[PDB]
């Protein structure tokens with residue numbers, strides 16, 4: 001029943017503390033098993049290796065925005081740019097309010113080396129950023145098919161400029177919090193990025 | 206100063222870069238840097254005390270090819286403080302794609318260098334560096350406003366952060382997926398885009 005299947009969520013949670021205190025590079029399954037109070041067998045039962053766990057920390061970040069995201073990417077949503085505003089606000093709200101989001105992000109950006117002894121962390125990350133880029137592009141097009149964003153704007157590049165700016169901000173708040181009142185000014189910070197996409201001639205063809 | 210220790214100093218740094226690049230900054234002992242560099246261990250000890258001193262010196266190295274433009278841009282008597290900043294950003298990107306040395310230290314710094322509350326000096330240094338860099342963009346952005354090169358009521362402080370986030374994230378995306386961003390081919394567009402956001406965006410005002 002309810003045992004074997006709930007251990008999974010207890011393994012992930014211990015994997016987070018372990019990763020947070022020690023770092024991905026130097027943590028081993030064994031470290032996580034002791035923390036979870038299970039055996040390395042219980043772990044191997046849900047996770048073939050340490051890259052799956054990491055992967056699972058990463059795939060957990062998408063859940064809260066899922067719907068707002070899917071909306072932005074829908075060709076039938078009359079407010080696609082407005083949907084991308086609500087998502088960015090939620091990404092930044094979730095970041096400031098949820099200890100758990102803050103720490104998975106803090107693990108991904110500042111613990112977590114790409115080493116060649118375990119290169120699926122890197123491959124997993126590349127691939128994750130491609131799929132997020134493709135999402136942004138469609139949203140970008142959808143707003144353009146709609147008078148919300150300048151016609152024949154460069155999707156691709158705007159997509160990358162947008163990612164760059166948000167990744168870099170998140171990582172910056174993650175380094176210096178008291179230096180960005182990210183919560184008190186979510187609106188300003190989001191629209192700065194929005195203003196770029198819609199006002200930058202360099203982002204045009 | 207002494208001519209032997211210089212080459213000696215130079216020979217440890219260079220091999221730290223090679224060493225963090227393969228093994229990363231968490232699982233690399235100053236002893237690895239030994240057998241790789243050649244130099245006897247205790248000298249690596251005369252030279253640097255731990256990891257935070259050495260990692261620090263990789264960062265310190267990065268800044269240098271950009272000294273002149275960055276302090277030009279920051280000078281209050283500089284007639285074109287946005288001009289310098291434009292070129293600076295060009296050099297930075299140009300140097301990233303070209304100089305194998307620069308692309309590597311950046312990879313180390315972004316991708317191979319964990320923060321643990323056990324390796325506090327790595328984080329502490331990082332924080333400090335960004336605050337310094339931050340202190341520069343703001344002065345320059347303030348000199349460009351004054352010159353009437355950036356909108357009048359520009360929020361310099363928020364603006365520097367905005368700019369800072371966009372470049373750091375662009376560098377990292379390029380490291381992560383170079384074949385995605387023709388950083389070298391479209392280099393002018395990438396700079397201008399970030400500059401456009403400083404000048405055009407309403408939200409960065411006041």
Ligand SMILES: O=C(CCc1ccc(O)cc1)c1c(O)cc(O)cc1O
Pocket residue numbers: 068069070071072073084087091132135136139162163166167170
């Ligand atoms: O722009 C973003 C998210 C930006 C972002 C990427 C990574 C991250 O860590 C935080 C925020 C975005 C999507 O992703 C999906 C969408 O349908 C619309 C949309 O606007």
Ligand SMILES: O=C(CCc1ccc(O)cc1)c1c(O)cc(O)cc1O
Pocket residue numbers: 058061062091105108109125128129132167315377378381
């Ligand atoms: O996967 C990432 C981080 C991407 C990234 C990792 C390393 C790097 O160097 C640059 C970018 C991520 C989040 O964290 C949060 C999101 O809502 C979406 C999202 O895609």
Ligand SMILES: O=C(CCc1ccc(O)cc1)c1c(O)cc(O)cc1O
Pocket residue numbers: 267274275276278279290293294297338339341342345372373
């Ligand atoms: O924007 C930057 C550097 C950004 C940056 C460079 C290298 C790097 O590795 C990461 C970020 C900058 C300064 O710092 C100081 C200035 O007076 C002007 C200026 O334009």
